[PDB]
Design an enzyme around this catalytic site. Structure first.
Site, short mmCIF file in Angstrom:
data_model
loop_
_atom_site.label_atom_id
_atom_site.label_comp_id
_atom_site.label_asym_id
_atom_site.label_seq_id
_atom_site.Cartn_x
_atom_site.Cartn_y
_atom_site.Cartn_z
N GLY A 35 -33.67 -3.90 0.36
CA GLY A 35 -33.29 -2.50 0.47
C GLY A 35 -31.81 -2.26 0.29
O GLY A 35 -31.41 -1.14 -0.07
N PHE A 36 -30.99 -3.29 0.50
CA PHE A 36 -29.54 -3.19 0.39
C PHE A 36 -29.08 -3.08 -1.07
O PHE A 36 -27.97 -2.58 -1.35
CB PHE A 36 -28.92 -4.44 1.03
CG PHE A 36 -29.20 -5.73 0.27
CD1 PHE A 36 -28.40 -6.12 -0.80
CD2 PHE A 36 -30.30 -6.51 0.59
CE1 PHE A 36 -28.66 -7.29 -1.51
CE2 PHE A 36 -30.58 -7.69 -0.12
CZ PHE A 36 -29.76 -8.08 -1.17
N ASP A 148 -27.69 -7.75 12.01
CA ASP A 148 -28.75 -8.08 11.06
C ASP A 148 -28.84 -9.59 10.87
O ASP A 148 -28.90 -10.10 9.75
CB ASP A 148 -28.52 -7.35 9.73
CG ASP A 148 -29.82 -7.14 8.93
OD1 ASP A 148 -30.94 -7.32 9.48
OD2 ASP A 148 -29.70 -6.79 7.74
N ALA A 152 -32.59 -14.63 5.84
CA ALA A 152 -32.11 -14.22 4.52
C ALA A 152 -30.60 -14.03 4.48
O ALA A 152 -30.00 -14.10 3.40
CB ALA A 152 -32.79 -12.92 4.07
N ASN A 153 -29.98 -13.80 5.64
CA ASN A 153 -28.53 -13.65 5.77
C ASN A 153 -27.84 -14.93 6.24
O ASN A 153 -26.68 -14.87 6.65
CB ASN A 153 -28.21 -12.50 6.73
CG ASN A 153 -28.40 -11.15 6.09
OD1 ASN A 153 -28.42 -11.02 4.85
ND2 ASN A 153 -28.61 -10.12 6.93
C1 LIG Z 1 -31.60 -22.97 -5.25
C2 LIG Z 1 -30.87 -21.94 -6.13
C3 LIG Z 1 -30.10 -22.61 -7.29
O1 LIG Z 1 -31.85 -21.06 -6.66
C4 LIG Z 1 -29.93 -21.10 -5.21
F1 LIG Z 1 -30.68 -20.41 -4.34
C5 LIG Z 1 -29.01 -20.14 -5.99
N1 LIG Z 1 -28.12 -19.29 -5.17
C6 LIG Z 1 -28.49 -18.07 -4.66
O2 LIG Z 1 -29.62 -17.60 -4.82
C7 LIG Z 1 -27.42 -17.34 -3.92
C8 LIG Z 1 -26.07 -17.68 -4.14
N2 LIG Z 1 -25.01 -17.08 -3.55
C9 LIG Z 1 -25.30 -16.04 -2.72
C10 LIG Z 1 -24.19 -15.40 -1.94
C11 LIG Z 1 -22.95 -15.98 -1.67
C12 LIG Z 1 -22.20 -15.18 -0.83
C13 LIG Z 1 -23.03 -14.06 -0.54
C14 LIG Z 1 -22.89 -12.90 0.24
C15 LIG Z 1 -23.96 -12.00 0.30
C16 LIG Z 1 -23.88 -10.78 1.06
N3 LIG Z 1 -23.86 -9.80 1.67
C17 LIG Z 1 -25.12 -12.26 -0.42
N4 LIG Z 1 -25.30 -13.37 -1.17
N5 LIG Z 1 -24.25 -14.23 -1.21
C18 LIG Z 1 -26.61 -15.65 -2.40
C19 LIG Z 1 -27.70 -16.26 -3.04
N6 LIG Z 1 -29.04 -15.87 -2.80
C20 LIG Z 1 -29.40 -14.85 -1.81
C21 LIG Z 1 -30.83 -15.12 -1.30
C22 LIG Z 1 -31.16 -14.05 -0.23
C23 LIG Z 1 -31.09 -12.64 -0.81
C24 LIG Z 1 -31.44 -11.63 0.26
C25 LIG Z 1 -30.65 -11.06 1.28
N7 LIG Z 1 -31.33 -10.19 2.03
N8 LIG Z 1 -32.55 -10.21 1.50
C26 LIG Z 1 -33.60 -9.37 2.08
F2 LIG Z 1 -33.80 -9.83 3.32
F3 LIG Z 1 -33.08 -8.15 2.10
C27 LIG Z 1 -32.70 -11.06 0.43
C28 LIG Z 1 -29.73 -12.34 -1.46
C29 LIG Z 1 -29.32 -13.45 -2.47
#
Ligand SMILES: CC(C)(O)[C@H](F)CNC(=O)c1cnc(-c2ccc3cc(C#N)cnn23)cc1N[C@H]1CC[C@H](c2cnn(C(F)F)c2)CC1
Length: 291
Positions: A35-36, A148, A152-153
């Site tokens: 949702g963000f 929060d 996932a965070n």
């Molecule tokens: C195994 C692979 C090779 O595939 C490996 F995984 C790839 N690397 C990634 O995927 C990945 C890489 N760097 C980030 C990163 C770094 C700093 C921040 C800060 C902030 C904020 N603020 C969000 N990300 N971030 C996040 C990543 N992945 C999150 C997964 C969870 C997601 C999410 C958050 N909430 N929800 C839901 F609950 F709403 C879903 C957001 C992206």
């Protein structure tokens, strides 16, 4: 205070291949969403970055407040168990936040083995829990309530060091209330669901994360019975089930003593009355004694 780079939006369009929505697992740029908004991979000056593009329940002014709040919190809070902001863009009608990329994504996704990553060992899960508590402790020592906490965070770098993320809802730490209840329902303390703002709610949500770590089950699954992981915890405490019935089977190194030890921590975190839960300092100590 940490200083951040102000990007022009068009630059972030370029580094994310125009916010390409195909998964990174097939050569696109999309890493996750909710949702963000949506988080995209890219490269800036050879640096791998995550670019969070915010999406519009919430007014534009409110969304701007959460954007401003994340930048203010990240300016003040630098710690190895917190993610690191590099920059942002706010020109025009878009808001983007740019971070150092996390090579192992979210804890939620590694517990579900999303995109074919190998199951986490029990030894690694214990270190991740300790790291996550160390980050929450830093936040609380600096008088921030996260609001929060969820798997996932909790993100993971190349060595699976745990890093707390998403401070857009953070608040400074009588009972403080708000008329706008925010959070993720399956992780929230009862008082948080009714509008209370207190660091004791972060502890309760962390207890849910400990259950996710022990069981490999997400806090909510609409296709599961019970849908809510908290209901499973009530079946154990009312003794129809045991925590051994729910230990993640995708592990080969979970000994029962330390598993019951981290379940003990989670159960203390999950007290309904907020004043009987441990503070984060005590949670740190209990997790260290377990290993
Ligand atoms: C195994 C692979 C090779 O595939 C490996 F995984 C790839 N690397 C990634 O995927 C990945 C890489 N760097 C980030 C990163 C770094 C700093 C921040 C800060 C902030 C904020 N603020 C969000 N990300 N971030 C996040 C990543 N992945 C999150 C997964 C969870 C997601 C999410 C958050 N909430 N929800 C839901 F609950 F709403 C879903 C957001 C992206």
């Amino acid at each position: 205070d940490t200083r951040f780079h102000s990007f022009s939006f068009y630059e972030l369009k370029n580094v994310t291949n125009n916010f390409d929505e195909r998964p990174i697992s097939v050569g696109g740029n999309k890493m996750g969403e909710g949702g963000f908004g949506v988080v995209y991979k890219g490269y800036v000056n050879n640096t791998t970055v995550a670019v969070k593009k915010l999406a519009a329940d919430i007014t534009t002014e409110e969304l701007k407040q959460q954007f401003d709040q994340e930048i203010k919190v990240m300016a003040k809070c630098q710690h190895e168990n917190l993610v690191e902001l590099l920059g942002f863009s706010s020109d025009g009608d878009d808001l983007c936040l740019v971070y150092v990329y996390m090579p192992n994504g979210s804890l939620l996704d590694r517990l579900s083995c999303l995109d074919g990553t190998p199951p986490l060992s029990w030894h690694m899960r214990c270190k991740i829990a300790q790291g996550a508590a160390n980050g929450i402790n830093f936040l609380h020592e600096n008088h921030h309530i996260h609001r929060d906490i969820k798997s996932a965070n909790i993100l993971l770098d190349e060595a699976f060091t745990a890093k707390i993320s998403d401070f857009g809802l953070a608040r400074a730490s009588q009972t403080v209330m708000t008329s706008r209840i925010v959070g993720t329902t399956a992780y929230m303390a009862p008082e948080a669901l009714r509008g209370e703002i207190t660091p004791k709610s972060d502890i309760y949500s962390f207890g849910v994360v400990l259950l996710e770590i022990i069981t490999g089950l997400p806090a909510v699954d609409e296709h599961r019975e019970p849908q809510l992981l908290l209901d499973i915890k009530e079946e154990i405490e009312d003794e129809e089930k045991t925590i051994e019935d729910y230990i993640d089977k995708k592990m080969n190194d979970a000994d029962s003593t330390s598993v019951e030890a981290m379940y003990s921590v989670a159960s203390q975190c999950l007290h309904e009355k907020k004043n009987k839960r441990p503070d984060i300092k005590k949670v740190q100590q209990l997790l260290q004694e377990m290993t």
